[PDB]
């Protein structure tokens, strides 16, 4: 279904635009114009994707779910508009009177001076405030009874001609048809656009006729007449299914009415003082509503409240440009390569699994005797997503959310995805990654010692006479390409404790390269080399 | 980035709508109105998602790629519009003349009757066709030199007051500001909506002022004056950054101009005969363009050109409602359960792999000695997606496309996904599935015997004294739920050869249930029971 709606719109758009082009030049250079029927052509073009004819010469589900509901909604609504206008007119048909022979004479003169066909019907009523038409298979034409009396300024002459032109061209009907089609074609709002364009042009063609049948010195007053027919009426742009002088929802119209309504009034400044402040408070209330923290959309840029030194490790990053953060527990000092980049937030990928698993451990979901689903050491060493998918399913989401909040987990965005950190909604900077892991063991008072240590052992990479190096990689691979070269970890040495996070964005930003890069950096910096 | 743009729009929308509500009632019941500043409020609300402040009380990549490009595009464009209007005015400023004391007297009277502040500037020129303003930090006010001469109908009195009201309220500037903001805020088309609303209302408030400072019997002519200022001018709605009587792109405007242009002309009927047919041919050309075969979007509904009998197997489907097709090679007859449903097209899921693998065999990509990547029997028996993902990567896509075409593979839609049949773009009915597989072995003359037989052996399910039953399951599991219970296959018996396809849509439409259902049906129908 949706593809048709979509492509129907496409069809329309294309055609429409082509036509408009012609419209553009016909008018611009020659004051010529498209025969409006082309808009049917347009419609038809809009309709024809339908042909179930094989002619030639990603979760998409919602696309159709939406298309289906939107459409049915539109049609009942638009149908309602239709029947109301229809009824108005049909009911009005009941109220439509025949003309006196000495009234009929004028109307007939206007049209049949050109021997126009008589397959139309002329009626009048006191219930007609302004010229209006209907169809009923008869092309019902209606004029104000007051206009039948007021046949002394010949506005009516002009009006009828205008109305006639609509009639010659069967405009009433064309519109009716279009509106009906528009209802089913409503998925394309442009049905109204074109409806409108048509109307505009219908009137233009009418104007052409008018001019075609009048003198050069009448052209002027006609234009004035267009104006009189709007100036002198409320702009009750009511008949959405026909024509009337006031049939347009716009500015001049609004303004003129306000003058009609000019019984001078004063709003207590308080009326608007209240509304404006209230609203402002309501806008403030929108601000109170999750103002969409640009801070959260933005990659982290808060100043590291902690000291620190800026590093230059560009030689090691080399072919895989990125950023890197290291921290000394003894000195409470950070060492940061490309701080602007270090502060950038990226989805954690598989490295988050350490948090997921350790949360399961603290909450007594996952344990040592029952670290299995593989065990935790195997699962972590081989990144077994299955193991971890179950762990998320087995941990109350609120436990996880609580920890995200308590220990400042980046943007703490849990998304809606059970594995939201896996190239999805949760994002964290390298700086934040270091801060959080360090605090996880050093400060977290809502997390057991066993969970801290059990997790730690599963991450050992290498060791020597100075230290034990722990960590975890992950690769942000999307649609087969590398985007996030993650490696995180910590070092326990015989003199200090260090925390760190590496992220590659350029070159081949794989988790493996991040591991290699981090180790090389940490060694050169003394972390893995005794300083 | 995009989230801000999106949510900014949301902000706007909300606020806007709230305001409009008030607008609605203030006007509807009391003829009262929002102080336009609320639209700044709106803007601001639109702007504030920006606050990088954490205040409170799926391939998304494209979302931001798009947001980024769209925005930069919009701003250079809108900036261009701005500078042009600005320049027009600044250049015009160069052309703006001072008034004669005996001209100045009138302008000053109009404003300072109310002791309005004099921090404005009044100028004139022959280059002013209609009233217009600028800012320049001075609130430049411009009137036609002809209006300075034509100070005898007091239109100018009315105009200035109108202009003044804009000035009292610093409208020129407000607009300027908005437009500038609108440029950066352009991602929200509603900036123009509100711009416009503001303008509309700016004029309304001006009208309020006018009325506030005039008599009841002047109100009328003012309205007439609004009209005169539009009636008597080309609607060159040019100054997108200011106000003028003609400053609106609409219908009445277009019509009136055409009258000005009324040097009667006739388009050779051919002008439009050509354009209309050409266009029609262009619409036909759009029809020539992939008319989006609704036939292709639609599930298969072509009549089975072959005979057939309709079945009732609803008892077996039972808890898992669906459809089923069986075919007799000897009789060239089909047996169909719920034909309307049998004809429905579904993505093949893993059952397509038989085609993928056999294509690799014929094209000499995959073979017997080298059926491995697992071998083919293991890969097929355990549905090893990895095996099959590589097979698609290793087969020229055109080979596959050729076979889709030659043997009528449903909608033959290869999508863009290397595994397009795996709950993606390729879809086939059960009827089509039977037709295609049967033809694959029976008719396909662009496919070797070895590929046909090698594939066949890998599908054996069960056998007895009457037959060998072959087939393949697959489960349309999406976001963890079952949607497509596939099982396809064929039977080689000692009396006939049969082909079939089962699909479940309701209950638990798993591949396993489809296997069980198919076998049970085939046995009851005599296929797997000697008849
Ligand atoms: Zn009309
Ligand atoms: Zn104005």
Numbering used by the authors:
A (entry chain A), B (entry chain B): 1 to 57, 97 to 412, 428 to 585
Question: What does the published report state?
Answer:
β-Lactam binding to the extracellular BlaR1 sensor domain regulates BlaI cleavage by the zinc metalloprotease domain in the cytoplasm. BlaR1 forms a domain-swapped dimer, with the zinc metalloprotease active site accessible from the cytoplasm. BlaR1 undergoes spontaneous autocleavage in cis between Ser283 and Phe284 and we describe the catalytic mechanism and specificity underlying the self and BlaI cleavage.
However, in the presence of ampicillin, we see a pronounced rigid body shift of about 6 Å to a position immediately abutting the membrane. The magnitude of this shift is consistent with the expected displacement of EL1 induced by the competitive binding of ampicillin. Thus, β-lactam binding and the consequent extrusion of EL1 from the active site appears to trigger movement of the sensor domain towards the outer leaflet of the membrane. Careful superposition of the reconstructions onto the re-entrant helices containing the catalytic HEXXH…E motif clearly demonstrates that structural elements on either side of the membrane are compressed towards each other in the presence of ampicillin. Central to this is helix α3, which traverses the membrane directly linking EL1 and the metalloprotease domain. On the inner leaflet, concomitant motions are observed, with the metalloprotease domain drawn up to the membrane in the presence of ampicillin. Although a range of states exists in all of the samples, the equilibrium is shifted—BlaR1(WT) is dominated by a more extended conformation and the BlaR1(F284A)–ampicillin structure is more compact, with the sensor directly in contact with the outer leaflet of the membrane.
